[PDB]
Design a protein that fits this description.
Four copies of one chain form a homotetramer. By secondary structure, chain A is of the alpha/beta class. Chain A has one domain (1-386): Alpha-Beta Barrel (TIM Barrel). Helices cover 46% and strands 8% of the residues of chain A. In chain A, helix 2 packs parallel to helix 4, helix 11 (295-321) packs across helix 16 (371-382) and helix 12 packs antiparallel against helix 16. Chains in contact: A-B, A-C, A-D, B-C, B-D, C-D. The complex binds D-glucose (4 copies), magnesium ion (4 copies) and hydroxide ion (4 copies). Residues 89, 134, 136, 180, 182, 216, 254, 286 of chain A line the site of one D-glucose. Chains A, B, C, D: Its EC number is 5.3.1.5. Chains A, B, C, D: Involved in D-xylose catabolism. Chains A, B, C, D: Mg(2+) 1 binds at residues 180, 216, 244, 286. Chains A, B, C, D: The active site is at residues 53, 56.
């Protein structure tokens, strides 16, 4: 087959297969899953680990003894299966108190509470061995213009991230942060709407080396953006700390379909990029099995996430290893793209007449790039017609 | 009226009112405009200056004496009118040689030529007194995945920008660079697709202080993004070096409608932001009078750009100066957004029981944000119903 | 200013002001509203009527005796205020049994249950005085290709609507049906995604005269379509039976902002069309008070809906009434557009040398359309700068 | 592998391979192709026929004698290769006289000239054997609200199409007309923007049986709509007279990528629908070889169109033929979907206690639809992992 094993580093959040199907126009179609039950069936499917929001593991408003009790049972299922916890995050979007945001809520007291709720879950994550802590600011934003002064809201967002950075620094924790962008939903527009806005923001933080991004396929596609290109810019910057894989069919509400569904060619170019750049983190799936499905359809969907990644990995490796493709890449001058434009510097370039006054503009313009032949070769490989 | 005068700093490119109406499915509907003729009618409309692509002023492939001749006549119309040239740029997209890009073309020789063509126009811009040099990489991108390795293409883009930065440094020129983002068109996806991706890229340049962004209203809207929010993040970073104003009606081809058309409420929040943050650069219009129009419709459209900015400036100033609005802003706690979340630092925050263990979550959650009242106040002011 | 009266016939759904605020990523921020409180509060706001889904009025699962009690409570409040009930609809989307649809579910027994639930509410709506019954097939569709054969699903959809028409015909009821299109959400793709698809479908029912459309501003805008142009096509067809007004800020999840918010110029062009076409049905607002709001924010938002419709009505009447505008329209040849192209038939046209042989194409091509001056006059009227 | 033959009836427009590459921001990258070279080259590629706009074949402005010479040259090449001409159309969008439209221009004389230009090419198309004549009203629309009264424009559009039907009826021609929808570009909004709007319009013409639609993959996707679902509705209506195949990577400018590129899974679902519905018309490709390509890239791209259609045909036949799939379909109750909801009428339905009173809603709600396993089986077939 294309069978997962933990070496594939496939991970899933408790809230993915655990989604009960409650949406904006409909009630839950499935019962709540026990986290222990999820750890056991994911290990049987070939998964390497699980991730969690604090409120996915410990129900909101738990007493301290109830909390110890929930953390205990989960720690026990983990130990018995060999499953790891590579990443964790905080829910700063479900409770009504976060209706205007967490870190950038207009009310000062909710911002402080958002910070304490996050620090408590960071202590727990480190204990369970997580090395990345994600922040998805889903309620940071606005539906209307005067409701949020975005320059002041970015001051408060930077304040919170700097505060968390000094906190993990004083404790000597080995954990880093990853910002998860999303352009809209549940808010009209969300602050730091794309991988680019998140990367630019991090450069203004006090300790920038502590923070990176955790891009999600469907989010960048909700802005009509090219997800493989955004990932290539995060890898060029040395900031791809983690990644969430799923599917989306266009610019519409966030679907969280299983990976491979939605834009299939972009899932092929994404796998090709992650494998050839040697990304070594978790291949995390942040998807929601459709609410039409019962619990068997939930595990069939999660199995399909891992399967589609292993089929696409195989076809992309076969495409880059093919002699005919290597030759087509040379024909489209991808080798010359790797050459410096002007390693001898600006003074030699200005003195070079072949670069301007003697350049044959029309002879260069008539060279076809042979890109369509190359792309049909990539299509034959993806489709297994070679 | 709402009459422009040069104090308003309104500027226009030679290619805007000069557009002949040639589009992907149709030929030109208007004759070419003489640049001198454009300088004279813009000064009569109340404009402060004009901008240009090299090939808008000096037709491609001019001989050196033809070039001196074209630069002469234009310099003469400028002097006789008092019009300034605040900005200039290079056309690295119209000639067939640039069909795979300029700075990131796969062919090494075209990249060198792209750099020499740009340096020649930088010398001319400085002479005419321009203080900002724009780069719009419209052909930097791809329609297919293997045709452009984006990590290597970002190396070549950084190489070119660093080369231009050492060039203006050695010459002692007082000019800075501004990157103009666009998500797609004419290419399938364009590198540095949004204000965020451009800001993140600049932080990886050798002399980052030399570069900023020049956002265009319609471009960010072609990705469904909020343009006032993107401008607020460029102002927060200290990188809004210039701005292009126009209109767009949604996610579709780039329309370049006159400013005020398209999303009218976003043009209101944009003017409110630029005026209250005290932006001091040109209010440049990069628009195309519809090809249904004759030359009188061309000057009526350009006049409407300046008029809509002066009406929106008036209504936004009236909105922020209204006592009822100041009170509604206090009611929605925009004042508390300006307070530091935790100026006493993380140790006091962790010791503060009112922040977590004694926080009344439900009492805070029931506080309405009063945002709808605030936004109807902004709507009454925009519409002049107060 | 601008107060709503009775002949304006603004109406609101029980579910609009009654939205408690739970969305895909969060829980309710408001308590449930008793329908009689909504009838009273809306009567005091100047509303002329209320509409309802069956389950907004009678909780799902109610016994025939609890049903009777909720209905008696509701008709007392109507009786006491003089509020009308112009339209009603069925909830065939919330209960998990409708997870794959109502009328086009794959399970035959769920389809029969859908039709019995609908027929039961039709009888109720008729005695209350509603003359329009709406269908919004929100769950009719799929997230994947083989899950629904769309030709067979359109035979089931037609069969359902024909059975409904047979039933109102046998009972002698005066009621007409209106289909409300939506392109996606909660399903990946919904059947009859736009006004055009719903109009074309009606033409295939056995009694087409019983069916029309109930378009919603936001829904056509979720496909990036022009909502005023869609409504002109439904009015051209004789099928605008009802309309839902609200706002949407682009292609993204369905926002249901209050009327006037979102695309403000499309709202002016819509009110200009409806008022100049003499539409006489209800002006119904199907919107959701943002969950950031308490109940005072809910009534402020609902009042804002009516106010924005009246300001835009005044501004559009002023635009059409201005002699400079009526002159601008003649300059743009909108009067020549109402002349028949060739009222004397195709033989006359063929014989006419001035229509081809002797037509002066270049003179005709050089005529400007003067559309920009005409649109800036409309901009000055909407903004009250005229 | 996979070679095109004659009974596949792949056809191409003279304008597709003949695209010289000038786009809104750049000049031609290729020389013009002589039509007889295109007929010969396409015959050698395995194409069954060519289509044409009048001005692709006879340059605009030609004298009746130059016209005769281009037509004689073209019919010799067809005669010599055995290539057919299944469809033809009129260019009513390039010449500046059509800047405001053809059939719905505001100038009455341009509308009459539009109809004479069309009638002249209809006579030509009939003697060549075309049985479908396409209309793409690319300039019919507006960029602003008062520039076009859409109800009067639909009376002019209907008047034009009725005059065309009167003309083919009087001549006894066997030709049918097909409308090709497009939502926008080159106009801000185009009239009859989708398959649904065009279908609904046809129903209002005097002879509806003479008119159907010619949908294009990319155009429905520019509105974010599901192209397989639109085509199933046109087939349900009896109106899929012709179809244009290509690719589009999202909501943006009209790309016209080769067939298979863009949304690859929508292309599989389209070929599965067309082949299982037994569509018999041409498989026409209306695409543009990217301007990065020389002429060898143009023929590689055009061959790729046919190859992708044949691979997807094989993969969809294999999916429908697999017993595990046909079992999965029964598990998802696609067979219950083809059963009448209530073939014994509405009195039987009303009397049935098992349809409402005694219906076990919770048992029915708990049934899983098994749609994910069925879609991963379709994913494995498209990818040849089965
Ligand atoms: O759109 C929803 C987000 O992607 C959500 O599922 C986040 O992943 C989670 O809050 C942790 O990052
Ligand atoms: O979409 C087109 C671009 O906006 C173009 O008009 C640039 O403005 C110009 O090349 C200079 O920046
Ligand atoms: O997207 C939601 C629909 O618009 C819904 O609110 C309908 O209004 C209702 O079911 C009656 O048509
Ligand atoms: O957007 C462009 C249209 O698709 C055009 O290529 C039509 O195919 C042609 O005019 C016949 O309909
Ligand atoms: Mg998501
Ligand atoms: Mg632009
Ligand atoms: Mg809605
Ligand atoms: Mg097209
Ligand atoms: O998500
Ligand atoms: O532009
Ligand atoms: O809605
Ligand atoms: O096209």
């Amino acid at each position: 087959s294309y069978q997962p094993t933990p070496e594939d580093r496939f991970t899933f959040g408790l809230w993915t297969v655990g989604w009960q199907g409650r949406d904006p126009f409909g009630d839950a179609t499935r019962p709540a899953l026990d986290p222990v039950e999820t750890v056991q069936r994911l290990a049987e499917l070939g998964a390497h680990g699980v991730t969690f929001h604090d409120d996915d593991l410990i129900p909101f408003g738990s007493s301290d003894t109830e909390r110890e009790s929930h953390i205990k049972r989960f720690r026990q299922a983990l130990d018995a299966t060999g499953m790891t916890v590579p990443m964790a995050t905080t829910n700063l979007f479900t409770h009504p108190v976060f209706k205007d945001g967490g870190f950038t809520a207009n009310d000062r007291d909710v911002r402080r509470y958002a910070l304490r709720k996050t620090i408590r879950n960071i202590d727990l994550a480190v204990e369970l061995g997580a090395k990345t802590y994600v922040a998805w600011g889903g309620r940071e934003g606005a539906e209307s213009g005067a409701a949020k002064d975005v320059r002041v809201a970015l001051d408060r967002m930077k304040e919170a991230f700097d505060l968390l950075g000094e906190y993990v620094t004083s404790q000597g924790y080995d954990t880093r942060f990853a910002i998860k962008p999303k352009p809209n939903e549940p808010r009209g527009d969300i602050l730091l709407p794309t991988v680019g806005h998140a990367l630019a923001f991090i450069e203004r933080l006090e300790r920038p080396e502590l923070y990176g991004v955790n891009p999600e396929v469907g989010h960048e596609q909700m802005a009509g953006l090219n997800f493989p290109h955004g990932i290539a810019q995060a890898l060029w910057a040395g900031k791809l700390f983690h990644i969430d894989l799923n599917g989306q069919s266009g610019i519409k509400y966030d679907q969280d379909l299983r990976f491979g569904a939605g834009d299939l060619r972009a899932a092929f170019w994404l796998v090709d990029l992650l494998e050839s750049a040697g990304y070594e983190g978790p291949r995390h799936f942040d998807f929601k099995p459709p609410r039409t499905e019962d619990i068997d359809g939930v595990w069939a969907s999660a199995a399909g996430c891992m399967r589609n990644y292993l089929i696409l990995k195989e076809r992309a490796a076969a495409f880059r290893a093919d002699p005919e493709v290597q030759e087509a890449l040379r024909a489209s001058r991808l080798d010359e793209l790797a050459q410096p434009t002007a390693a001898d510097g600006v003074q030699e370039l200005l003195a070079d007449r072949t670069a301007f006054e003697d350049f044959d503009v029309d002879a260069a313009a008539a060279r076809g790039m042979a890109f369509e032949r190359l792309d049909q070769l990539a299509m034959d490989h993806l489709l297994g017609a070679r």
